[PDB]
Design a protein around this nucleic acid. Structure first.
Lengths: 130, 129, 150, 83, 95
RNA sequence: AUUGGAGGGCAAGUCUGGUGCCAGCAGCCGCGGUAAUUCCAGCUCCAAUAGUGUAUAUUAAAGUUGCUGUGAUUAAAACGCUCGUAGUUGAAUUAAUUACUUUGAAUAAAAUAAGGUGUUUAAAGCAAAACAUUAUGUUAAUGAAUAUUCAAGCAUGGGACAAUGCAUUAAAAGGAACAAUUGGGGUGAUUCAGAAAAUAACGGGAGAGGUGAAAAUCCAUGAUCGCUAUAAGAUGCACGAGAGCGAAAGCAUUUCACUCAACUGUGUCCAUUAAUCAAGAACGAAAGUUAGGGGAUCGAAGACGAUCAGAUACCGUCGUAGUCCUAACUAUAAACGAUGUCAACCAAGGAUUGGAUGAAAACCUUGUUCAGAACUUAAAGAGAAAUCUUGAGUUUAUGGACUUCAGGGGGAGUAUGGUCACAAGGCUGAAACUUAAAGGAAU
RNA sequence: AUCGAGGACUACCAAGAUUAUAACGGAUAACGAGGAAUUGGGGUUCGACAUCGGAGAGGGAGCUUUACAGAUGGCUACCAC
RNA sequence: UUAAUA
């Protein structure tokens, strides 16, 4: 339909064909409010309950230290990295932490086995300056 | 079926010049086809043409002289406002000195240069470099 | 190409570049009209009427002699059939195929071609109604066409 | 064709070879003729590609048989082209 | 992709052809795709033709031949050395 | 003067101390197993700078959402095929509205653009002054014309291209008619053939099948083998082809009917009746289902015997449903040319099928031309290439008309919901989660 | 009845109205617009919030005064405080 | 005739 009066089908075709966009459909359908532990929020707060260590993928070797967090807004249970060197010793238990994303990689990112969230505060200032 | 006779004619002319042919033949003749050729003659892109009468919307034979790079028709003839001229030329023409559009207006079928001079817009027909 | 199959033939007739009657033709319109008039009374299609004049009377084109077409001549005399000739012949074929189909129920190619023929009828009937040739009350029906076509 | 001829002045031979429709100005290949009867002297004018039995106007020495593209005149029927 | 322009068949203007049976495998192959070879041989081998002609009860009886048409599937044509695998540019030769 | 970094993307160290596939770094590729350019530090310099990193989201990049502007042979993607309504698009042609186009009217500012103005520049403000040394005078000083501006509405000049209006011709558009044909096109009846197997009778008298070798099995109640007779089922060799017909699936003994379609021929008729088509409708291989008939051969299941480590398989023997016909369902295939339908232009050939038309006396050899299935060459056109050329060409020099489909790989044509079917199943058809590749052509 | 047109309401009469050009439904983390961010052209996303228009005062509902209110920094009743 | 795996 390349005609001069064929604007109904041209407009209607883009409506249907736009739903095949994986990156665009995901941001429109109702899943960011139900299937996202973080939600729309950039950062979230939760309580540390368990200190975990996840083995890396096959071409790597070592244990990725991380923590298990119970968020306040929802109540879900997640896993959060502990950035740079020796920062797990700074993290106590049953305390509030600020959890904030990662890049997004191929979804998962840098503690390898399915972790997608990194602890940026320990109540304190920073699991940087600390 | 033949929807646009002008599209058939301009494709015949462009094909003939890519092969270096001297003259080409167009089976269905129209007023619009004749006007498009007249515009192309005024810019000396075709030497001349003759129209044979077959009592059946007769044929046109066009003489070409190594100058018509490409003449093409434009599908549905958009209503070109006078302010939309340079938007069309920037898209369809190679530069600001070489080619020329073709528009059908109430004052006849004219290229973009003299339609701008006559201060009138209309539907766009085609172009030629 | 043809409407319903991928066949593509260009078997046509070629009208000469002479809209007037040829010099050797001498019969006036009076003989042409009455000769055509007598043929119409015999129950002959307008397409066949012109052929008979061309083959026998040497009047190959009637518009070149009388200035008006065969159908226009027949309408003026009132001898034009109520059902247009091309539509009438199409309903004659649909009836004939249907009659064969009553005894041969297993013929699946005749059922297909009957469907194509009836689709043609609904295309022509729609056109002639927009041209006011057929009154809007006209409608093609299998139970009825057997009698009017007969 | 790579080699090209004039498209306005085709030769007499070239136009004759082409299809009846693909000429410069299309022309029919048929004609009107009259046939002198073998039985009598009358000449019956008829189409070249007649699609029916051709009878004399006097009697009916049938003068031609329609055969899918041109009249099959009898061997004793002489004709001339009506110009 | 397409190793052959004709897809290895001989069918151009139709949609279906009947089946034939491989003379060695018994496989079903379409009539066009089958490798058809013709054979015309005498009923007596070249060694025994002299022996039969010596002691015969007929004046000048001419030894008859046997005629039969053999059709092979692709697998049993290649394996039986009826046809060989050819070069990429020599596949096109049809003589 | 700080923030981030110094393997690549990305500017910057193949400097020195520790660490030894650990700790870790790492958005991606990846570096680390004791000589780390990537870890932790020291020195140095790289970028920006009163800013600089991180996380989420919008925009550009994305010609990876396409009107400008994509892709559909093989990478993902042309409905199995035809008919068909709305929708979209519609041949040439003539010396009242609408649409289109040009000017305006009217229309809140702020904001955007833009005119002036030394807030010391600038972002600002719409004021201040330039000089009159200014009360005086420019002066009754500036207010940017401040322009917008799309979709509607109002007025005006034009009527080329278009729609609804209410008499041209005869399209290498379409339809109809006629003449001669073509057709393994379809339906019904009729009709021929002998292979295999069964039976009847006779001869013969010890094997026969089958395999790589065998075994299971058949045979003295006379098998295999040979001749002669029969009656059903099924099938339709050789002719049989890069040949024909059909919308596709598909169609092969010869006769007679009933149909149908197409090509060619035409100074025959109509006069736009056309193309593509959501919804909808006919036909749709094989398998499968229901109920009758038939039940020869072969044979999913099954049962034996071999082989093997095992063999529920390949090999051999037997064998049920099925294979065949009638009526009704089912509606799927690598339903393939993996290539939608219609239309125009288009390099050299040789041959073939069916016509028309000259020559040469139905058949055959040649010239021309129309239609059909194909084939060969290309230093040319296209493409990632293979390859395509009766297009997959005429496309960044991007627009002839219309419909369908695709958006990294999986999950998955799965779950659920709806609907069709007696059932198997068919049509529509996700998400959570997971992952840096999966894939195409060629060396 | 209202300031007033009007099924706005009542009585009788008729069977009509919308829909594939998407009605009736469902969602919105939806007040609309002037406008904002980013853009070669085309566009995409945002706009609670300067200004214009609409609606509300914890949830409905019913009213008083008056030229203007179904007012809530007015009143009455029910629910939650 | 048989010929599985790293």
């Amino acid at each position: 339909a390349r005609g001069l009066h064929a604007a109904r089908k041209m407009l209607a075709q883009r409506r249907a064909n736009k739903w095949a966009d994986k990156e665009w459909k995901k941001g429109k359908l109702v899943t960011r409010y139900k299937c996202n532990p973080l939600g729309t929020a950039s950062h979230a707060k939760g309580l540390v309950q368990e200190k975990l260590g996840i083995e890396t993928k096959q071409p790597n070797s070592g244990i990725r230290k991380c923590v298990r967090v119970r968020l306040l807004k929802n109540g879900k249970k997640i896993t959060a990295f502990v950035p740079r060197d020796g920062s797990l010793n700074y993290v106590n238990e049953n305390d509030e932490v600020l959890i904030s994303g990662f890049g997004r990689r191929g979804h998962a990112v840098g503690d390898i086995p399915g972790v997608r969230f990194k602890v940026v505060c320990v109540a304190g200032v920073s699991l940087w300056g600390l | 079926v033949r929807v646009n006779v002008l599209a058939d004619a301009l494709k015949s002319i462009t094909n003939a010049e890519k092969q270096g042919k001297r003259q080409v033949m167009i089976r269905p003749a129209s007023k619009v086809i004749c006007e498009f050729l007249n515009v192309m003659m005024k810019h000396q892109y075709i030497t001349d043409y003759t129209v044979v009468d077959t009592h059946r919307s007769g044929k046109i034979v066009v003489n070409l002289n190594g100058r018509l790079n490409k003449c093409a028709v434009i599908s549905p003839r958009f209503n070109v406002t006078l302010s939309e001229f340079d938007k069309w030329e920037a898209n369809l023409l190679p530069s600001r000195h070489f080619g020329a559009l073709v528009l059908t207006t109430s004052y006849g079928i004219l290229d973009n240069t003299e339609a701008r001079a006559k201060h009138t817009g209309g539907r766009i027909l085609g172009f030629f470099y | 190409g043809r409407m319903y199959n991928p066949g593509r033939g260009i078997s046509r007739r070629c009208i000469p570049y002479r809209r007037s009657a040829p010099s050797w033709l001498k019969t006036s319109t009076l003989e042409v009209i009455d000769e055509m008039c007598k043929l119409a009374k015999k129950g002959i299609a307008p397409s066949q009427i012109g052929a008979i004049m061309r083959d026998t009377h040497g009047v190959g084109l009637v518009k070149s002699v009388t200035g008006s077409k065969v159908l226009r001549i027949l309408k003026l005399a009132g001898l034009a059939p109520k059902i247009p000739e091309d539509l009438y012949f199409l309903m004659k074929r649909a009836v004939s195929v249907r009659k064969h189909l009553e005894k041969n129920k297993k013929d699946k190619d005749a059922k297909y071609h009957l469907i194509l023929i009836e689709s043609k009828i609904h295309r022509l009937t729609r056109y002639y109604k927009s041209a006011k040739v057929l009154e809007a009350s006209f409608k093609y029906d299998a139970n009825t066409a057997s009698a009017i076509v007969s | 064709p790579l080699i090209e001829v004039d498209l306005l002045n085709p030769t007499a031979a070239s136009e004759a070879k082409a299809h009846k429709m693909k000429r410069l100005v299309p022309t029919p290949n048929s004609y009107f003729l009259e046939i002198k009867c073998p039985k009598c002297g009358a000449t019956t004018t008829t189409f070249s590609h007649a699609h029916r039995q051709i009878l004399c106007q006097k009697c009916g020495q049938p003068l031609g048989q329609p055969t899918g593209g041109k009249l099959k005149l009898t061997q004793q029927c002489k004709f001339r082209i009506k110009k | 992709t397409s190793k052959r322009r004709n897809n290895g068949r001989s069918k151009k203007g139709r949609g279906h052809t009947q089946n034939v049976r491989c003379s060695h495998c018994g496989r079903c192959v379409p009539k066009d795709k089958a490798i058809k070879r013709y054979q015309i041989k005498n009923i007596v081998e070249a060694a025994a033709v002299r022996d039969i002609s010596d002691n015969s009860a007929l004046t000048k009886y001419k030894l008859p031949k046997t005629y039969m048409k053999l059709e092979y599937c692709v697998s049993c044509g290649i394996h039986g050395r009826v046809v060989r695998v050819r070069s990429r540019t020599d596949r096109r030769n049809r003589l």
